[PDB]
């Protein structure tokens, strides 16, 4: 009632069911990528200090031949993204916008990412990946929840409470 | 296991319990502003067309003498934000950046923001707000969840899976 942000989220609500977000990179690559590098990233998530590069993310960008020499091909990556939504126009609008946001926003933490990229394995079999991918690939993902197309959003008592929670509460 | 983003989040996990995010605007002001314009804002989420301005935010930006003539006082707001977290240096780093991100992201969607300010009330008794207030503060609100200091975050099974969820699932 009075305190919605006390309550927390709606219980059995899946944001992908509330919002059918598209593949900017093929869904089966990430399943593969996660299963490969999921266990490590979940550790690295709980580490302090300089943030460690997300290996799922570099593994995915490698596969699509977008990453090379510490470099993600922004130029090539965009169109790669533009092509996914050739089939869903309501998303075309968002993705274009989100791209330069993610990239130019990534430009702010260049010095921290540059630091993140130089690190050595925290234990046996830790793969040190360049964090740039995971910036962009997380950034893009978070971005697509945030401005879900009014045309694609799944509306219901739950998903409404869900959109309502996430929309109002962060500032509350 | 393999698909964590299938399972969804844990149900009884508060993102603010996992991260006791600071009040940059008095926690009780938002209660009032929410209590006043809450029903109205929850409608506008479901409305189409040009995005409608968040009034809670505008009301809060008013009360703290930050909103005036359709213009948010960037300088004073900047300064107001430090004053909240002067007592939490672990947040200062974050707060400064989030300030400039939120503003500069708002710089991107200006022509879209401008349209929202010109709209006409959809019926009897709609109060129309400038979307800038709700823009910056929603941006601001999500950011500190997003960059919750490893020093501030509560470590436990839930809060850890939760973090694990939010970092990895958006990109899947």
PDB file of N, CA, C and O in Angstrom, chain B residues 39-65:
ATOM      1  N   UNK B  39      -1.279   7.270  -7.530  1.00  0.00           N
ATOM      2  CA  UNK B  39      -2.287   6.614  -8.347  1.00  0.00           C
ATOM      3  C   UNK B  39      -2.154   7.106  -9.772  1.00  0.00           C
ATOM      4  O   UNK B  39      -2.273   6.353 -10.724  1.00  0.00           O
ATOM      5  N   UNK B  40      -1.875   8.392  -9.893  1.00  0.00           N
ATOM      6  CA  UNK B  40      -1.765   9.050 -11.176  1.00  0.00           C
ATOM      7  C   UNK B  40      -0.576   8.542 -11.973  1.00  0.00           C
ATOM      8  O   UNK B  40      -0.693   8.258 -13.165  1.00  0.00           O
ATOM      9  N   UNK B  41       0.568   8.415 -11.314  1.00  0.00           N
ATOM     10  CA  UNK B  41       1.769   7.946 -11.987  1.00  0.00           C
ATOM     11  C   UNK B  41       1.612   6.493 -12.460  1.00  0.00           C
ATOM     12  O   UNK B  41       2.068   6.141 -13.544  1.00  0.00           O
ATOM     13  N   UNK B  42       0.932   5.672 -11.665  1.00  0.00           N
ATOM     14  CA  UNK B  42       0.693   4.272 -12.003  1.00  0.00           C
ATOM     15  C   UNK B  42      -0.213   4.103 -13.221  1.00  0.00           C
ATOM     16  O   UNK B  42      -0.169   3.080 -13.890  1.00  0.00           O
ATOM     17  N   UNK B  43      -1.067   5.085 -13.476  1.00  0.00           N
ATOM     18  CA  UNK B  43      -1.846   5.130 -14.706  1.00  0.00           C
ATOM     19  C   UNK B  43      -0.928   5.363 -15.891  1.00  0.00           C
ATOM     20  O   UNK B  43      -0.863   4.560 -16.814  1.00  0.00           O
ATOM     21  N   UNK B  44      -0.207   6.474 -15.829  1.00  0.00           N
ATOM     22  CA  UNK B  44       0.682   6.938 -16.891  1.00  0.00           C
ATOM     23  C   UNK B  44       1.697   5.922 -17.417  1.00  0.00           C
ATOM     24  O   UNK B  44       2.232   6.061 -18.533  1.00  0.00           O
ATOM     25  N   UNK B  45       2.003   4.932 -16.590  1.00  0.00           N
ATOM     26  CA  UNK B  45       2.870   3.839 -17.006  1.00  0.00           C
ATOM     27  C   UNK B  45       2.166   3.007 -18.050  1.00  0.00           C
ATOM     28  O   UNK B  45       2.790   2.423 -18.931  1.00  0.00           O
ATOM     29  N   UNK B  46       0.848   2.988 -17.963  1.00  0.00           N
ATOM     30  CA  UNK B  46       0.072   2.158 -18.851  1.00  0.00           C
ATOM     31  C   UNK B  46      -0.392   2.942 -20.055  1.00  0.00           C
ATOM     32  O   UNK B  46      -0.921   2.378 -21.003  1.00  0.00           O
ATOM     33  N   UNK B  47      -0.157   4.245 -20.042  1.00  0.00           N
ATOM     34  CA  UNK B  47      -0.535   5.065 -21.183  1.00  0.00           C
ATOM     35  C   UNK B  47       0.467   5.084 -22.331  1.00  0.00           C
ATOM     36  O   UNK B  47       1.681   5.042 -22.132  1.00  0.00           O
ATOM     37  N   UNK B  48      -0.076   5.190 -23.536  1.00  0.00           N
ATOM     38  CA  UNK B  48       0.712   5.185 -24.756  1.00  0.00           C
ATOM     39  C   UNK B  48       1.145   6.580 -25.168  1.00  0.00           C
ATOM     40  O   UNK B  48       0.927   7.560 -24.446  1.00  0.00           O
ATOM     41  N   UNK B  49       1.756   6.648 -26.350  1.00  0.00           N
ATOM     42  CA  UNK B  49       2.099   7.907 -26.972  1.00  0.00           C
ATOM     43  C   UNK B  49       3.385   8.435 -26.393  1.00  0.00           C
ATOM     44  O   UNK B  49       4.223   7.676 -25.905  1.00  0.00           O
ATOM     45  N   UNK B  50       3.532   9.751 -26.464  1.00  0.00           N
ATOM     46  CA  UNK B  50       4.579  10.459 -25.743  1.00  0.00           C
ATOM     47  C   UNK B  50       4.589  10.104 -24.258  1.00  0.00           C
ATOM     48  O   UNK B  50       3.541  10.069 -23.606  1.00  0.00           O
ATOM     49  N   UNK B  51       5.781   9.812 -23.723  1.00  0.00           N
ATOM     50  CA  UNK B  51       5.910   9.522 -22.290  1.00  0.00           C
ATOM     51  C   UNK B  51       5.481  10.705 -21.408  1.00  0.00           C
ATOM     52  O   UNK B  51       5.817  11.861 -21.702  1.00  0.00           O
ATOM     53  N   UNK B  52       4.735  10.408 -20.344  1.00  0.00           N
ATOM     54  CA  UNK B  52       4.236  11.442 -19.448  1.00  0.00           C
ATOM     55  C   UNK B  52       5.160  11.641 -18.248  1.00  0.00           C
ATOM     56  O   UNK B  52       5.600  10.677 -17.614  1.00  0.00           O
ATOM     57  N   UNK B  53       5.398  12.905 -17.912  1.00  0.00           N
ATOM     58  CA  UNK B  53       6.359  13.264 -16.890  1.00  0.00           C
ATOM     59  C   UNK B  53       6.048  12.751 -15.512  1.00  0.00           C
ATOM     60  O   UNK B  53       4.901  12.788 -15.083  1.00  0.00           O
ATOM     61  N   UNK B  54       7.073  12.300 -14.797  1.00  0.00           N
ATOM     62  CA  UNK B  54       6.842  11.845 -13.439  1.00  0.00           C
ATOM     63  C   UNK B  54       6.704  13.059 -12.529  1.00  0.00           C
ATOM     64  O   UNK B  54       7.567  13.954 -12.514  1.00  0.00           O
ATOM     65  N   UNK B  55       5.559  13.103 -11.847  1.00  0.00           N
ATOM     66  CA  UNK B  55       5.150  14.218 -10.997  1.00  0.00           C
ATOM     67  C   UNK B  55       5.674  14.081  -9.602  1.00  0.00           C
ATOM     68  O   UNK B  55       5.866  15.068  -8.900  1.00  0.00           O
ATOM     69  N   UNK B  56       5.863  12.840  -9.187  1.00  0.00           N
ATOM     70  CA  UNK B  56       6.427  12.589  -7.892  1.00  0.00           C
ATOM     71  C   UNK B  56       7.783  13.276  -7.887  1.00  0.00           C
ATOM     72  O   UNK B  56       8.084  14.106  -7.035  1.00  0.00           O
ATOM     73  N   UNK B  57       8.560  12.974  -8.915  1.00  0.00           N
ATOM     74  CA  UNK B  57       9.888  13.513  -9.077  1.00  0.00           C
ATOM     75  C   UNK B  57       9.843  15.005  -9.184  1.00  0.00           C
ATOM     76  O   UNK B  57      10.662  15.693  -8.606  1.00  0.00           O
ATOM     77  N   UNK B  58       8.900  15.510  -9.960  1.00  0.00           N
ATOM     78  CA  UNK B  58       8.784  16.944 -10.113  1.00  0.00           C
ATOM     79  C   UNK B  58       8.358  17.565  -8.785  1.00  0.00           C
ATOM     80  O   UNK B  58       8.869  18.602  -8.381  1.00  0.00           O
ATOM     81  N   UNK B  59       7.420  16.923  -8.103  1.00  0.00           N
ATOM     82  CA  UNK B  59       7.023  17.386  -6.780  1.00  0.00           C
ATOM     83  C   UNK B  59       8.201  17.406  -5.804  1.00  0.00           C
ATOM     84  O   UNK B  59       8.404  18.381  -5.086  1.00  0.00           O
ATOM     85  N   UNK B  60       9.001  16.351  -5.812  1.00  0.00           N
ATOM     86  CA  UNK B  60      10.182  16.310  -4.973  1.00  0.00           C
ATOM     87  C   UNK B  60      11.206  17.348  -5.422  1.00  0.00           C
ATOM     88  O   UNK B  60      11.862  17.992  -4.613  1.00  0.00           O
ATOM     89  N   UNK B  61      11.327  17.540  -6.720  1.00  0.00           N
ATOM     90  CA  UNK B  61      12.312  18.479  -7.208  1.00  0.00           C
ATOM     91  C   UNK B  61      11.858  19.887  -6.933  1.00  0.00           C
ATOM     92  O   UNK B  61      12.656  20.800  -6.890  1.00  0.00           O
ATOM     93  N   UNK B  62      10.554  20.062  -6.819  1.00  0.00           N
ATOM     94  CA  UNK B  62       9.985  21.317  -6.345  1.00  0.00           C
ATOM     95  C   UNK B  62      10.262  21.633  -4.891  1.00  0.00           C
ATOM     96  O   UNK B  62      10.758  22.704  -4.578  1.00  0.00           O
ATOM     97  N   UNK B  63       9.969  20.672  -4.023  1.00  0.00           N
ATOM     98  CA  UNK B  63      10.012  20.849  -2.579  1.00  0.00           C
ATOM     99  C   UNK B  63      11.401  21.210  -2.075  1.00  0.00           C
ATOM    100  O   UNK B  63      11.577  21.972  -1.131  1.00  0.00           O
ATOM    101  N   UNK B  64      12.388  20.621  -2.714  1.00  0.00           N
ATOM    102  CA  UNK B  64      13.771  20.809  -2.365  1.00  0.00           C
ATOM    103  C   UNK B  64      14.303  22.024  -3.123  1.00  0.00           C
ATOM    104  O   UNK B  64      15.508  22.254  -3.181  1.00  0.00           O
ATOM    105  N   UNK B  65      13.373  22.780  -3.708  1.00  0.00           N
ATOM    106  CA  UNK B  65      13.655  24.019  -4.432  1.00  0.00           C
ATOM    107  C   UNK B  65      14.646  23.821  -5.560  1.00  0.00           C
ATOM    108  O   UNK B  65      15.510  24.663  -5.809  1.00  0.00           O
TER     109      UNK B  65
END
